[PDB]
Design an enzyme around this catalytic site. Structure first.
Site, short mmCIF file in Angstrom:
data_model
loop_
_atom_site.label_atom_id
_atom_site.label_comp_id
_atom_site.label_asym_id
_atom_site.label_seq_id
_atom_site.Cartn_x
_atom_site.Cartn_y
_atom_site.Cartn_z
N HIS A 76 0.76 -1.29 -0.01
CA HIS A 76 0.01 0.05 0.01
C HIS A 76 0.82 1.22 -0.08
CE1 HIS A 76 -2.90 2.92 1.20
NE2 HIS A 76 -3.91 1.96 0.96
N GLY B 234 0.84 5.51 10.70
CA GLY B 234 2.11 5.20 10.62
C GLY B 234 2.78 4.12 11.02
N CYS C 54 1.94 1.07 9.73
CA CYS C 54 1.90 0.05 8.77
C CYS C 54 3.48 -0.56 8.50
CB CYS C 54 1.58 0.66 7.23
SG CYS C 54 -0.06 1.30 7.36
#
EC number: 3.4.19.12
Lengths: 306, 306
Positions: free
Chosen positions: B41, B143, B145
């Site tokens: 992503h 943040g 991820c």
């Protein structure tokens, strides 16, 4: 979102953990620059433990009696001295992994991360609070003496705890890194016991704020209370008094939630008087008191460390 | 003694965490040998997020679009490819801190340690279980991820989880390190939701054994039950069925406590039917289900990791 009992990343402390062996006793040491710190009880033997005599015990020791093992590498001991209940072993090698650090004593109600260690090898990491009675509810087995507790602030490790022993209720007592006990405990076998504890009121309020931030609001109400009227209720339930400084420290959390500190006290009052009626808060059926205001802000806002 | 939710020492994983930036999106990557792994992503933008199109998105990218930062050192990307929901960035430098590792997918009911990370900088470590509905009850902010979950076995890090997003109940979904989701989730914004969960029966029994080992015995009784008769009660309280394999796995704990597995089932039965009557078990007022039999043996016996 979410709220977990979260420790500091342990890597900077893992790199300092060594094995200290004297005679038949083996425990953990903390290697920073060219000194290894460890509980002085390493120089005791299975009959010296009753009322030892540590100045006498240490003068009878030489450097070569101390075997220090950093992983699979032996460190040469070139000096030894005692500071209160810790031994300081000077070694001929400075730890190349020494982080930037401080030795800081914490207050009851403050939290820290523990790196549980055995034979110099880290085993696990978890979060603890220092209880009002100066014990910690740790998880330690035989061989964990010398495991350390710590906080990390940007790049700097603030060591605050060295593990020494278990009390008969299964709670734990230890020292700061100057060798001074937390609480009225000694590194002996006596009949010593924890003594009366209380619940850390400001931490419970911080945790209720964490819950609100995370979407648990069922315990809120329209009521408020006075600091005086709250403290009268706190005292029947064995909660610590709440001070104006605690109120001030809760300010930021009160600000982002829009819930006045005294309003949250009213909610805690009702929770103490009514229980939780089968519900839970942040996955707990008990009022949780081992997160500080700082811990809540850290996890519900998200700072890191380098 | 004592029993804590205890993570693995995070040092071996801290040394692999990097920052991956593409366009205006920044998240965490995992640097092992000369590959950085991160959620795909990272190549999405604030309107590509609705039903993205990742093969198309990636062919339009070049190596120089990917900025990889290992602390204060920039890594040169020399190749990029996608494996399911993860991106694999080949870099011109092998991570000198690469531990020995495996990529292992875990089962629902199994636990692991999470190193929460922001901008490539580790923030905290905590323990999670993979729920029966393939979510985890994590603690993640914007943040996070690319933060990873892992177990450590002697010297070997078994990576099992990469964080991807938060579901509307505040629980978390992610992938194994091959980029395959745990559960029926996608790395998009849909109306996707967790769906029905259950309690991990074998873990609750393991935790009751931990309590007995640690001195909580008030919930024991003289009764026993059949596996069949227990499973009928488990099903009204939304507990998972207990199998003979679970019974077998509980054998060692049953052996040191002297409490037959089926006897402990009888105790759990009563706890489910009567509640806890104001008492606590290992400091909890709820039946705790996120410790495995292995976790209990590890902490109530004390193995380490090198």
């Amino acid at each position: 979102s979410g709220f977990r009992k979260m420790a500091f990343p342990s890597g900077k402390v893992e790199g300092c953990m060594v094995q200290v062996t004297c005679g038949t006793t083996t425990l953990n040491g903390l290697w920073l620059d060219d000194v290894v710190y460890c509980p002085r009880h390493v120089i005791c033997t299975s009959e010296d433990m009753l009322n030892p005599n540590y100045e006498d015990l240490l003068i009878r020791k030489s450097n070569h009696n101390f075997l220090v093992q950093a992983g699979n590498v032996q460190l040469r001991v070139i000096g030894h001295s005692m500071q209160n209940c810790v031994l300081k072993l000077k070694v001929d090698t400075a730890n190349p992994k020494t982080p930037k650090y401080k030795f800081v004593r914490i207050q009851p109600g403050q939290t820290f991360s523990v790196l549980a260690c055995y034979n110099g090898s880290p085993s696990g990491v978890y979060q603890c609070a220092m209880r009002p009675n100066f014990t910690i509810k740790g998880s330690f087995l035989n061989g964990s003496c010398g495991s350390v507790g710590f906080n990390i602030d940007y790049d700097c490790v603030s060591f605050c705890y060295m593990h020494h022993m278990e009390l008969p209720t299964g709670v734990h007592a230890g020292t700061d890194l100057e060798g001074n006990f937390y609480g009225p405990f000694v590194d002996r076998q006596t009949a010593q016991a924890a003594g009366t504890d209380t619940t850390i009121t400001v931490n419970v309020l911080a945790w209720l704020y964490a819950a609100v931030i995370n979407g648990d609001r069922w315990f809120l109400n329209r009521f408020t209370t006075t600091l005086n009227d709250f403290n009268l209720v706190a005292m029947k339930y064995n909660y610590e008094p709440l001070t104006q400084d605690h109120v001030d420290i809760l300010g930021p959390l009160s600000a982002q939630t829009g819930i006045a500190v005294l309003d949250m006290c009213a909610s805690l009052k009702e929770l103490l008087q009514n229980g939780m009626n089968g519900r839970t808060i942040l996955g707990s059926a008990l009022l949780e008191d081992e997160f500080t205001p700082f811990d809540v802000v850290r996890q519900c806002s998200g700072v890191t460390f380098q």
